[PDB]
Design a protein around this ligand. Structure first.
Ligand code: WXY
Length: 167
């Protein structure tokens, strides 16, 4: 039993809710919140900008030190950093950005990072400003992640379309 509330169950291990991941993170305090990161950990907009703003820019300060030490992430890769006031940890995962021409096949590699964590609160990778089809992202998620994932979908219209078209 866990503290996630109001989710629709899609499969054995994947759950979905129309929610603001920032508000869900602050209420739930999950062990892991996933950020929709880029390779430079520049949290300017979309989910990353929202999560970073909610940390009063502490996420960005920590991220800049991470990059200065380690260099950029790989597309499809991840790193674990602090969750600040939102979660125990933040898993920064880089899905491919279609608006940069990155290979959508790397979306599966991106979701594989979730399997290193027993339970996660997450957005749909490569959705939103990353330019992928969210229906496809949900399919890749369901077919790749084996751990327990609670997906927060900000847009109600998109949430209803994801549920109603789910196979
Ligand atoms: O739904 C979300 C989303 N999901 C969870 N937490 C969130 N926080 C802030 C936004 C947000 N996003 C993020 C990028 C674009 C998109 C997907 C595509 C349709 C517009 C909205």
């Amino acid at each position: 039993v866990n503290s996630f509330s109001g989710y629709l169950k899609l499969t054995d291990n994947v759950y979905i809710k129309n929610a603001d991941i920032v508000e869900e993170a602050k209420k739930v305090k999950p062990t892991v919140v996933v950020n929709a990161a880029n390779v430079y950990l520049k949290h300017g907009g979309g989910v990353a900008g929202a999560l970073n703003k909610a940390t009063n820019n502490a996420m960005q300060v920590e991220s800049d030190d991470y990059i200065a030490t380690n260099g950029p992430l790989k597309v499809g890769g991840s790193c674990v950093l602090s969750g600040h006031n939102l979660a125990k940890h933040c898993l920064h995962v880089v899905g491919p950005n279609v608006n940069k021409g990155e290979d959508i096949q790397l979306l599966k590699s991106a979701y594989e990072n979730f399997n290193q964590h027993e339970v996660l609160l997450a957005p749909l990778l490569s959705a939103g400003i990353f330019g992928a089809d969210p229906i496809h992202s949900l399919r890749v998620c369901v077919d790749t992640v084996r751990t327990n994932v609670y997906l927060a979908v900000f847009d109600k219209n998109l949430y209803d379309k994801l549920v109603s078209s789910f196979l």
